[PDB]
Amino acid sequence: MREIVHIQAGQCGNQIGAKFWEVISDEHGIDPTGTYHGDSDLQLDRISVYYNEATGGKYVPRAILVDLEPGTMDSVRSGPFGQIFRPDNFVFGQSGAGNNWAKGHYTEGAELVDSVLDVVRKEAESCDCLQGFQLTHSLGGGTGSGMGTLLISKIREEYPDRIMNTFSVVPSPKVSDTVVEPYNATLSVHQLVENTDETYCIDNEALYDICFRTLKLTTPTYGDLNHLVSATMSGVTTCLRFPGQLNADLRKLAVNMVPFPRLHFFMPGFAPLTSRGSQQYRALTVPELTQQVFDAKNMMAACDPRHGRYLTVAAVFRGRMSMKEVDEQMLNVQNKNSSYFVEWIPNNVKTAVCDIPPRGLKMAVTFIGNSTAIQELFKRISEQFTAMFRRKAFLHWYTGEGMDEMEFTEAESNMNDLVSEYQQYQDATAE
Amino acid sequence: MREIVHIQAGQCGNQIGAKFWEVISDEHGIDPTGTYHGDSDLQLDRISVYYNEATGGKYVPRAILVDLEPGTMDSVRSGPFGQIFRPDNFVFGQSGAGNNWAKGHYTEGAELVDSVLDVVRKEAESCDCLQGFQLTHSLGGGTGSGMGTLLISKIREEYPDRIMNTFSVVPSPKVSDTVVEPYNATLSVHQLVENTDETYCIDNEALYDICFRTLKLTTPTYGDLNHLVSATMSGVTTCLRFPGQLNADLRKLAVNMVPFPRLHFFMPGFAPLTSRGSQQYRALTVPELTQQVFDAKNMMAACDPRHGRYLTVAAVFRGRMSMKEVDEQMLNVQNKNSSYFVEWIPNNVKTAVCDIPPRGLKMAVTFIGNSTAIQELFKRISEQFTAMFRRKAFLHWYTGEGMDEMEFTEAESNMNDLVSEYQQYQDATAE
Amino acid sequence: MRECISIHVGQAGVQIGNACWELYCLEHGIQPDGQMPDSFNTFFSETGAGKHVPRAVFVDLEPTVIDEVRTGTYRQLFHPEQLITGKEDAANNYARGHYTIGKEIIDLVLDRIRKLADQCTGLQGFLVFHSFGGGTGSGFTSLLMERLSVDYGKKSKLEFSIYPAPQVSTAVVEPYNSILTTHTTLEHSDCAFMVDNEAIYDICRRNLDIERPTYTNLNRLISQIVSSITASLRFDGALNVDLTEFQTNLVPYPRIHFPLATYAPVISAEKAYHEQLSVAEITNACFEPANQMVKCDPRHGKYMACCLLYRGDVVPKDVNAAIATIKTKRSIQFVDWCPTGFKVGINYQPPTVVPGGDLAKVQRAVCMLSNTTAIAEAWARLDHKFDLMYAKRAFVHWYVGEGMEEGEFSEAREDMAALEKDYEEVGVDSVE
Amino acid sequence: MRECISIHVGQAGVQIGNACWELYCLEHGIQPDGQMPDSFNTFFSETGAGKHVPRAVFVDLEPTVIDEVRTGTYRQLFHPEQLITGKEDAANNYARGHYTIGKEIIDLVLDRIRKLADQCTGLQGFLVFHSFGGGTGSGFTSLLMERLSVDYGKKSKLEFSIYPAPQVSTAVVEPYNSILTTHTTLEHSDCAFMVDNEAIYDICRRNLDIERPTYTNLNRLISQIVSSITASLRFDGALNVDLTEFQTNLVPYPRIHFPLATYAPVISAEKAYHEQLSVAEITNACFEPANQMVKCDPRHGKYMACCLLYRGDVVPKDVNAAIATIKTKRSIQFVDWCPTGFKVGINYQPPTVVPGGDLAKVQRAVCMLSNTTAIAEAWARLDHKFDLMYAKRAFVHWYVGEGMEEGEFSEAREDMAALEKDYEEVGVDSVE
Amino acid sequence: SSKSNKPIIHNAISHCCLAGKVNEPHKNSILEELEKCDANHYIILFRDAGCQFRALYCYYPDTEEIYKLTGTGPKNITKKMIDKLYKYSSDRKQFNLIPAKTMSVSVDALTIHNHLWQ
Ligand SMILES: CC(=O)O[C@H]1C(=O)[C@@]2(C)[C@H]([C@H](OC(=O)c3ccccc3)[C@]3(O)C[C@H](OC(=O)[C@H](O)[C@@H](NC(=O)c4ccccc4)c4ccccc4)C(C)=C1C3(C)C)[C@]1(OC(C)=O)CO[C@@H]1C[C@@H]2O
Ligand SMILES: Nc1nc2c(ncn2[C@@H]2O[C@H](COP(=O)(O)OP(=O)(O)OP(=O)(O)O)[C@@H](O)[C@H]2O)c(=O)[nH]1
Ligand SMILES: Nc1nc2c(ncn2[C@@H]2O[C@H](COP(=O)(O)OP(=O)(O)OP(=O)(O)O)[C@@H](O)[C@H]2O)c(=O)[nH]1
Ligand SMILES: Nc1nc2c(ncn2[C@@H]2O[C@H](COP(=O)(O)OP(=O)(O)O)[C@@H](O)[C@H]2O)c(=O)[nH]1
Ligand SMILES: Nc1nc2c(ncn2[C@@H]2O[C@H](COP(=O)(O)OP(=O)(O)O)[C@@H](O)[C@H]2O)c(=O)[nH]1
Ligand SMILES: [Mg+2]
Ligand SMILES: [Mg+2]
């Protein structure tokens, strides 16, 4: 039934997932207990993609929650939608990663990786046909960049022909939250571009502005940012667990999207985003949902799509609609924006239509970008790496954990190899 | 009706049996008085395997309780399910074995053995067709190792065509409870490799971790460890006295499980083992009960089955289920673990299914192992025997009771003969 | 007595077949349950208790769209053995429908086909519905047409492709999947029919005045073509053409076997009035460049062999009228070496309208199938959509990693450039 | 006037016989009391009052499985002198069921058989239901076929063995038992029918769509085969075949007398529709390499002799239609020295379905008994499982200690070595 | 850049056929020679249908060269001497059945006839 395992790690991944399992349980009518109370059987025809049936009609999420300090795991266990999990899954250490890549990948990560994989191995056994692994982590924190990249390198030795999609949270350009997070991002891109088939890239700088401008909110708590992120996370797999006219999955959104095996960093986007009272001023039509999508003011990754060009584009729509409009609107926003799409990939917009709206809406669009627009996002972090490495400040908290000075010279040479390929295809033209 | 006689030697055997007859009597609806209060007559079609009917509808256990100090006997008689026994059976001396083997087998054991055997001779006369004798003793104490194997060598002179399954308790690797329990165990394996057809070896080291991790308990009393051993103890004879699709007695479990007349030290296993609250997060299916069994974290003998290889395997299921699933899961855990099973015994998984579950569940598995995985259990004791023999400490408590020094050299050469044969079949392969 | 079976590979074939097998049950009065309150023996093998079941095989690689049919209105009709699924679909990947996944269950398909030929004494031909887009529709069909030509050989084989549109595209590697599947199907298929999605949106908007159709309303039109090609087997008319008679009257060379289709009349209920719909009129509805179902200009090429399939209440004197006026007209240019370019069937059945439909009730109809030179531009297009996505080696590593030669693509296009030149070879006229 | 009795050794025979004798009491209207609201004198010796009691001896060494029969629904039917029990089961030990425990009550069995032959004027044959695994079914039976061949000699003696599966095993010393119980039944039986469990689990899952069957739902299938061999002694057929006729048409050499049964149709209640089930169809269900109830490949070996046992509303022209198509086919290879390879039986009874059952109600059915070469591969397996255990002398000491020679095994394998070479002796074709 | 099954065979020997610590000296006797052959495809020869490991091959497509690297058995096999086709499910860590009979890159293990062992 093409089951998906949902591994989480870090402080960011758990709080995303603690809203994400709140998000999925409304699409299937699951209470805080775990017993079904929905309406239609389409919630239960493909209920097994994210769940295991328990004795007595209960359901449990196929979720594996990993941390190194027990603070966040107690927080999810105390809140609502927290008792629904399996208590055998909450793997945690007693030390804390200490906002450190080396301590979460060499020192404390190498002692608590075994108790993780032995439950990952157990959750793979309950599956009939394993579709793949989705992982939710950071790239700036200590855990989600070190312990997260350990659970990919250990899994791809074990499940080499399975799709491995992380939904990382990229550090933001202007605001920060960590002094050494340029060091943590350079050490993870070495581990992500070789073992993950695709990686959705999310900023916070791009995510506050949508809460301010388009949503028209004044006080965005993280429970309202992750509330917005988890709409995209459900929107990708909703074509794998619902009937549609034209269908997609976690695999069709990997062959249609990644033209070269290194260039697989995606930038999401969602629409509609109304306000509390401004919902009654716009028309809820397929030509209206498209023009909200292809703006630069709705992309959740803080970069300009107008700088650089698209390579592939997926537009996973939802709700009931008409297939002529979708085949025309995607033509319409390719001809008027014919300098934004690349030349040597003709007709590059992968369409996917589900038949089921989100619970309460009428139609909605999940957008999956793939561009050269994220070439400066890696050019930015590689510049924040370069200044802090010439003075080699903050180095002794990494060197003292068994890490050599050559390893920073490798990944920065590796990241300039990534930037050189986006510049290679941005100017590559055919004759 | 294939009657079984239950002897209880030592302190530990009197405390397993004081819970064991509490365990049996709920499978037959028996009050503390001895009268019947159950519901289904299937409790009473084979009630005469363990019980002698008394006048007025009562039933007494066919049980014989042997000790030397009279302390534990009063504890059984004062406690509940104590008056159900026969007051003629409580045979005991007045000295106490004093945690000494030569005192309990030669000195004090040779003065109370005749008062025991005359009741053993009496209990056999009430039986129609005697199936065999089950014994319940330690391997570390003075009584259950000295008075116990005295009763075996007398009985096997008396009843040569009878199966004799002592359910021994083996000392633990890390924690101990007796300074000279390497001495009291090397002297008893000399008697047990020659006179008992099978011997279920049980540790305490692996038995706490099952109480700690799988059961999720904080303070496990002996009334919660012996509560777990007594579940296995009834489950071996759970199909000798109840109908089933495929049947097993104490004799079928002796022919299929014993490839060679010396290699007959077994190791148990049980499933399901839930928690108080985590009973509602796992599925109760026959493929789920199988994978719980074949872990190394559920074998009550403190040794890894992944060290060493299996020779034969029994699996005495209970409850109502489907015979296809069992015959596929026993095939399933043989192909993926074909390195663990030995090659020159093809399709070595004996199967048995009762029709009656334990009182309250739906299905359950009792497991019997037979492995080379206990080659280091004897290698551990024969090393602690050897190093305490070079300085020959604690010897005058044995020599002064009438024992020669050659007998220690004999039993040590006996046990290294046993370890050498487990090593022989572990590496012998056919072509 | 002349039995014909139908395989539906891919998602495109099944939802077309949902529109198809709904339509035959409406013609013959067959209930969805299988009951009915004698010539229809070609698709519906009956049972001792009267319950007719179709001759269908719905093969797929993902279980998604099959479960809609197992729970839909026509659950009771189909034989539940027939519905073959898998676990992971090929997922827009030719290299997974022909080397990895479809290989695993190719024996389950052919064995069930083997249990359908044996009830048929007069086995006529095949009807494989597929697309060119997806991996299942293009990779498993290229596997299945290989196996049946080895198994049977003599039998007629018909495809109903969903050709990829020139301007609308719902996939990214869609020109990779066609060149791989056309290289394979060229020597095993025998008369493949081309239907686009884009040109039906032109018809559904203009001629029908529906601004918002669906795949549902695009498959009611393709159901009317398939019902009318096989309208001469299932019924009795003044002049009945056969499925073996199409592959003679339409195939001038063993390579060129791509006729495109056209249905007429396609008018709404309001425009069902206000005009008269004569046989002298509906024939001229077919030869327009705006009424085709493949986005090509027929005035840029030459018709090699037309084939009109009239039905309903048509008088054959008017067919002498409506045809003889056409090859006197100037713009419709046939081929100079072919002085005779028609093959006509007149049947006694009007086309039946499905309830809850969009088309009008008419008393006459025509399903023109026409072979022409004008599809050479539609093959000159995908070769331009091939060399751009291959010069950069785009999307290759998803194909190499499933048992494929990376030098196979240069060979597969080489067996398209020859087919590119053959339409130009035929289209010129050798004098003397 | 032709009476045939049935013995039930072991746990496997009694639980099969529970499924047997329940099924006959439905074919004839017999109550569980023996009452009924007459050609069934073959199995039911009646009483002066209205009561029919069976001709069955339920012998066992443990009293466990017998107490179900003495307390179940058919308590009143049987005769309480028949139900011979013992004290201790043979306990997966051939050397206990033949030298030690079975020797004790072998006289009470033969005395009770003696009182059942005396009510029979025209005594026909013997039926033994026994496994090969357990000690009773393989060790007490090998004593019992020895005794009845001395007591009677001339009468036909049929077994219905349970062959041990190539992949599923519920015992450990099970290849020790099957070699010893084949050394003895080879010369004192007549026609041992082979039935496996593993092949029925495939039939219970694929052809029946039941994911979780039981020994109950397996024994409903072996009851139908037994009720099809002996349905010609119990009804008025157009072409009846006797138990004295199966010994002749199927046994070309006195060593080779091991056929393997096959039943058809085996379909669920919902797939009872959707297909027509004529005798040109259900015949091809039998010769599949996927419907045989022994896990062997019939495409590897050659059928020496088939024996089709039709029943129901079957017409012997269509039988000639069904059989003549078969030995024109290429994959089925009959043996070259044998030009005739069939034996047909038509009876006028549809198969009767037990309530609370799983097989659907059909109006025609077939058992197929056939002596193929392909079981030589199944005998090649038990010599390979023998030599991996005897070379290390595993499990020998439980057999030596009950009256056995340590060289008796190597003598008994030498019997199986000669029996292995006899199938390959026959499967070749001596020309000229 | 091509297709291989070396990370699958390395995964399969180390976890399903030679997983226990008994065969750990024997696992190193075979695994160290696998890093040296330049074959793209490999395939595992069992003995029975119970899939006990005894031999390892290397397979060359378009020539069907089935040369033997480690284990005991014949040097080369053909399509005549085959019984069953296995595939290593990385999901289950268990060799399943392929109902087909064509030896391709998705096929990971096989069984030969009983005639080749007597
Ligand atoms: C309302 C209800 O269904 O309660 C159950 C129950 O909640 C659970 C949690 C029980 C419970 O067991 C324990 O909590 C436990 C405590 C200490 C050591 C080991 C276990 C139960 O206490 C134990 C008890 O077991 C029995 O009744 C069996 O017959 C069992 N009996 C005893 O162990 C026993 C206990 C006290 C006095 C006398 C006998 C048995 C098992 C094998 C062989 C013979 C007997 C059961 C089903 C229950 C309770 C009451 C809560 C479980 O255990 C057993 C052995 O069944 C633990 O996981 C299982 C799953 C059960 O569902
Ligand atoms: N006319 C029509 N075209 C359809 C329909 N469904 C899909 N298509 C077309 O089919 C093509 C996509 O191929 P699919 O059939 O969906 O893919 P598939 O055969 O399932 O293959 P995979 O999903 O890759 O395994 C596109 O050109 C769609 O427009 C339909 O109902 N009608
Ligand atoms: N088909 C079928 N096989 C059965 C049944 N019961 C047992 N068997 C098979 O019989 C074999 C075991 O032999 P048993 O008959 O139980 O043993 P036994 O004859 O009683 O001999 P002992 O118990 O050793 O004295 C195994 O292969 C079982 O699968 C049944 O109801 N149906
Ligand atoms: N979107 C989002 N980002 C968060 C959340 N919590 C933390 N982050 C971001 O995660 C980063 C800090 O990493 P963190 O996961 O807490 O560290 P770790 O626990 O060592 O992995 C910062 O960039 C935070 O902005 C959250 O709930 N939502
Ligand atoms: N499982 C279990 N072990 C016990 C119990 N009581 C004592 N033991 C063990 O028995 C050993 C001591 O032997 P003991 O029987 O008291 O001495 P004896 O009376 O001279 O035979 C130690 O290993 C104890 O852990 C009990 O109730 N349960
Ligand atoms: Mg598909
Ligand atoms: Mg028995």
CATH 3.30.1330.20 in chain B is located at 260-373
Q: Could B335 and E17 be called an inter-chain contact, meaning their C-beta atoms sit closer than 8 Å? A: no
Domain coverage including residue E51 = 1-118
Residue B338 near residue E52, CB atoms below 8 Å? yes
Q: Could C103 and E104 be called an inter-chain contact, meaning their C-beta atoms sit closer than 8 Å? A: yes
Question: Which domain CATH number covers D363?
Answer: 3.30.1330.20
Beta bridge partners of C193: C160
Q: How far is CA B207 from CA A351, A409, B19, B215, E57, in A?
A: 58, 52, 16, 11, 45
Tokens of B12: 């530990």
Beta bridge partners of C56: C6
Nearest Cα residue to B304 out of B291, B290, B313, B294: B294
Q: How far is CA D237 from CA D230, D241, D312, D345, in A?
A: 12, 9, 9, 8
Q: Is residue C191 domain-shared with residue C304, that is, in the same domain? A: no
Q: Could A158 and E7 be called an inter-chain contact, meaning their C-beta atoms sit closer than 8 Å? A: no
* Residues contacting B203, CB < 8 A, separation 6+: B169, B170, B171, B172, B173, B300, B301, B302
**Backbone φ, ψ for residue D165 (5° rounding):** -75, 150
For chains C and D, count residue pairs whose Cβ atoms are closer than 8 Å.
23
Q: Could B278 and A53 be called an inter-chain contact, meaning their C-beta atoms sit closer than 8 Å? A: no
Please state, in angstroms and rounded to a whole number, the distance separating the CA atoms of residues D380 and B390. Answer: 57
Q: Is residue D303 domain-shared with residue D221, that is, in the same domain? A: no
Per DSSP, helices labelled H in D361-431 are 375-390, 397-400, 408-427
Other residues' Cβ atoms within 10 Å of the Cβ of residue A321: 21
Please state, in angstroms and rounded to a whole number, the distance separating the CA atoms of residues A100 and A97. Answer: 6
E88: buried, middle or exposed (CB in 10 Å: 19+, 13-18, 0-12)? Answer: buried
Chain E residues with CB under 8 Å of A161 CB are 8, 90
Q: Could C104 and E99 be called an inter-chain contact, meaning their C-beta atoms sit closer than 8 Å? A: yes
* Residues contacting A185, CB < 8 A, separation 6+: A139, A140, A145, A170, A171, A381, A385
Domain count, chain C: 3
Cα–chain-centroid distance for residue C84? 22
Residue at which a domain ends, from C352, C374, C396:
C374
Q: Could D274 and C80 be called an inter-chain contact, meaning their C-beta atoms sit closer than 8 Å? A: yes
Q: Is residue D80 domain-shared with residue D193, that is, in the same domain? A: yes
Beta pairing, strands B51-53 & B3-9: unpaired
CATH 1.10.287.600 in chain A is located at 374-431
Tokens of D114: 């003696």
SS3 A94: coil
Beta bridge partners of A63: A6
Q: Is residue C203 domain-shared with residue C300, that is, in the same domain? A: no
Best mutation target, B43, B198, B255, B258, to test chain D (most D CBs within 10 A): B255
Q: Is E11 on the interface with B (CB under 8 A)?
A: no
Q: Between E20, E93, E95, which is nearest B339 by CB?
A: E20
Number of H helices, E strands in chain A: 14, 11
Q: Is residue C55 domain-shared with residue C196, that is, in the same domain? A: yes
**Backbone φ, ψ for residue A224 (5° rounding):** -115, -15
Query: Which ligand lies nearest the alpha carbon of B28?
Result: 1
* Residues contacting D125, CB < 8 A, separation 6+: D4, D155, D156, D157, D158, D243, D244
From atom 9 of ligand 4, which residue's Cα is the shortest distance away? A12
Q: Is residue C215 domain-shared with residue C343, that is, in the same domain? A: no
Rg of chain D, C-alpha, whole Å: 21
Q: Is residue D390 domain-shared with residue D367, that is, in the same domain? A: no
Q: Is residue C26 domain-shared with residue C154, that is, in the same domain? A: yes
From atom 17 of ligand 5, which residue's Cα is the shortest distance away? B141
Most ligand 3 atoms within 8 A of CB, residue of D61, D131, D222 to mutate: D131
Nearest Cα residue to D134 out of D190, D95, D186, D82: D95
A176: buried, middle or exposed (CB in 10 Å: 19+, 13-18, 0-12)? Answer: middle
- The crossing angle, in degrees rounded to 10, of helices A406-426 and A375-390 is 150
Is residue B136 within 6 Å of ligand 5 at its C-beta? no
Q: Which ligand 1 atom is nearest residue B227's CA?
A: 18
Residue of chain E with shortest Cα separation from A158: E11
Q: Between E18, E22, E51, which is nearest B308 by CB?
A: E22
**Backbone φ, ψ for residue C377 (5° rounding):** -70, -35
Residue that is written with structure tokens 């050269």 in the block:
A372
Q: Position B151: which residue type?
A: L
**Backbone φ, ψ for residue A349 (5° rounding):** -120, 105
Please state, in angstroms and rounded to a whole number, the distance separating the CA atoms of residues B396 and A337. Answer: 100
Q: How far is CA C362 from CA C267, C285, C359, in A?
A: 9, 14, 9
For A:133-192, CB contacts with C below 8 A are none
SS3 D154: coil
Residue C145 near residue C128, CB atoms below 8 Å? yes
Residue of chain C with shortest Cα separation from A162: C88
C149: buried, middle or exposed (CB in 10 Å: 19+, 13-18, 0-12)? Answer: middle
- The crossing angle, in degrees rounded to 10, of helices B10-25 and B222-236 is 70
CATH 3.40.50.1440 in chain B is located at 1-259
Strand boundaries in A171-273, DSSP class E: 198-202, 265-271
Q: Obtained via which technique?
A: cryo-EM
Beta bridge partners of D198: none
Please state, in angstroms and rounded to a whole number, the distance separating the CA atoms of residues E44 and B187. Answer: 49
Residue that is written with structure tokens 């059952």 in the block:
D357
Q: Tell me how close the Cα of E8 comes to any Cα of chain B, in angstroms.
A: 16
CATH topology (fold) of A1-259: Rossmann fold (3.40.50)
D131 annotated binding-site participant: yes
Residue of chain D with shortest Cα separation from E50: D167
Residue A168 near residue A137, CB atoms below 8 Å? yes
**Backbone φ, ψ for residue E6 (5° rounding):** -60, -40
Helix (H) or strand (E) holding D4: strand D4-9
Q: Could D270 and C80 be called an inter-chain contact, meaning their C-beta atoms sit closer than 8 Å? A: yes
Residue D120 near residue D88, CB atoms below 8 Å? no
Please state, in angstroms and rounded to a whole number, the distance separating the CA atoms of residues D173 and D179. Answer: 11
* Sheet containing E109-111, strands listed edge to edge, beginning at the edge strand earlier in sequence: E68-71, E53-59, E41-46, E109-111, E84-89, E94-98
- The crossing angle, in degrees rounded to 10, of helices A323-335 and A286-293 is 40
**Backbone φ, ψ for residue B47 (5° rounding):** -70, -25
SS3 A96: coil
Nearest Cα residue to D309 out of D244, D264, D360, D375: D264
For chains D and E, count residue pairs whose Cβ atoms are closer than 8 Å.
7
Residue B155 near residue B28, CB atoms below 8 Å? no
Query: Which ligand lies nearest the alpha carbon of A327?
Result: 2
Are chains C and B touching, using the cut-off of 8 Å on CB pairs and a minimum of 3 such pairs?
no
Q: How far is CA E24 from CA B309, B427, E31, E43, in A?
A: 13, 13, 10, 21
Please state, in angstroms and rounded to a whole number, the distance separating the CA atoms of residues D220 and D225. Answer: 9
Which of D27, D245, D377, D420 is the catalytic position? D245
Question: Which domain CATH number covers D11?
Answer: 3.40.50.1440
Q: Is residue C226 domain-shared with residue C78, that is, in the same domain? A: yes
CATH topology (fold) of A260-373: 60s Ribosomal Protein L30; Chain: A; (3.30.1330)
Please state, in angstroms and rounded to a whole number, the distance separating the CA atoms of residues D98 and A228. Answer: 78
* Residues contacting C284, CB < 8 A, separation 6+: C322, C326
Span from the CA of B18 to the centroid of ligand 5 (angstroms): 13
Q: Is residue C254 domain-shared with residue C285, that is, in the same domain? A: no
- By annotation, the residues of C acting in catalysis are 245
Q: Tell me how close the Cα of D15 comes to any Cα of chain B, in angstroms.
A: 9
Q: Which ligand 4 atom is nearest residue A207's CA?
A: 1
Please state, in angstroms and rounded to a whole number, the distance separating the CA atoms of residues B388 and B381. Answer: 11
Residue A312 near residue A344, CB atoms below 8 Å? no
User: The domain A374-431: what is its CATH number?
Assistant: 1.10.287.600
Residue that is written with structure tokens 């401004």 in the block:
A278
Tokens of C239: 């002049």
Residue B233 near residue B23, CB atoms below 8 Å? yes
SS3 D266: coil
Chain D residues with CB under 8 Å of C48 CB are 276-277
Nearest Cα residue to B62 out of B21, B27, B118: B21
Q: Which ligand 5 atom is nearest residue B67's CA?
A: 19
Nearest Cα residue to C229 out of C342, C310, C121: C310
Residue C405 near residue A363, CB atoms below 8 Å? no
Q: Which ligand 2 atom is nearest residue C174's CA?
A: 27
Q: Is residue C149 domain-shared with residue C169, that is, in the same domain? A: yes
Q: Tell me how close the Cα of A25 comes to any Cα of chain B, in angstroms.
A: 17
SS3 A126: coil
**Backbone φ, ψ for residue E68 (5° rounding):** -100, 130
Q: What 3 state SS string does chain C have?
A: CCCEEEEECHHHHHHHHHHHHHHHHHHCCCCCCCCCCCCCCCCEECCCCCCCEECEECECCCCHHHHHHHHCCCCCCCCCCCCECCCCCCCCCHHHHCCCCCCCCHHHHHHHHHHHHCCCCCCCEEEEECCCCCHHHHHHHHHHHHHHHHHCCCCEEEEEEEECCCCCCCCCCHHHHHHHHHHHHCCCCCEEEEEECHHHHHHHHHCCCCCCCCHHHHHHHHHHHHHHHCCCCCCCCCECCCHHHHHHHCCCCCCCCCCEEEEECCCCCCCCCCCCCCHHHHCCCCCCCCCCCCCCCHHHCCEEEEECEEEECCCHHHHHHHHHCCCCCCCCCECCCCCCCCCCEECCCCCCCCCCCCCCCCCEEEEEEEEEHHHHHHHHHHCHHHHHHHHCCCCCHHHHCCCCCCCHHHHHHHHHHHHHHHHHHHHCCCCC
Q: How open is the CA angle E104-E106-E112, to the nearest 5 degrees?
A: 65
Q: Classify the C-alpha dihedral A89-A95-A99-A101 as positive or negative.
A: negative
Is residue B169 within 6 Å of ligand 5 at its C-beta? yes
Please state, in angstroms and rounded to a whole number, the distance separating the CA atoms of residues B324 and B320. Answer: 13
What is the widest separation between alpha-carbon atoms in chain A? Answer: 66
Nearest Cα residue to A143 out of A248, A13, A337, A318: A13
Q: What is the DSSP letter of A54?
A: P
Best mutation target, E11, E21, E26, to test chain B (most B CBs within 10 A): E21
Q: What is the DSSP letter of D118?
A: T
Domain coverage including residue D290 = 260-374
Per DSSP, helices labelled H in A2-142 are 10-24, 42-45, 71-78, 114-125
Chain E residues with CB under 8 Å of C104 CB are 98-100, 106
SS3 D116: helix
Please state, in angstroms and rounded to a whole number, the distance separating the CA atoms of residues A318 and A272. Answer: 11
Q: How open is the CA angle B296-B298-B299, to the nearest 5 degrees?
A: 75
Best mutation target, E48, E51, E84, E115, to test chain D (most D CBs within 10 A): E48
Please state, in angstroms and rounded to a whole number, the distance separating the CA atoms of residues D314 and D280. Answer: 11
Q: How far is CA B111 from CA B9, B116, B121, B147, in A?
A: 15, 10, 17, 10
Q: Is residue C241 domain-shared with residue C370, that is, in the same domain? A: no
Residue that is written with structure tokens 């072991």 in the block:
D10
Q: Chains touching chain B at 3 or more Cβ pairs under 8 angstroms?
A: A, D, E
Domain count, chain E: 1
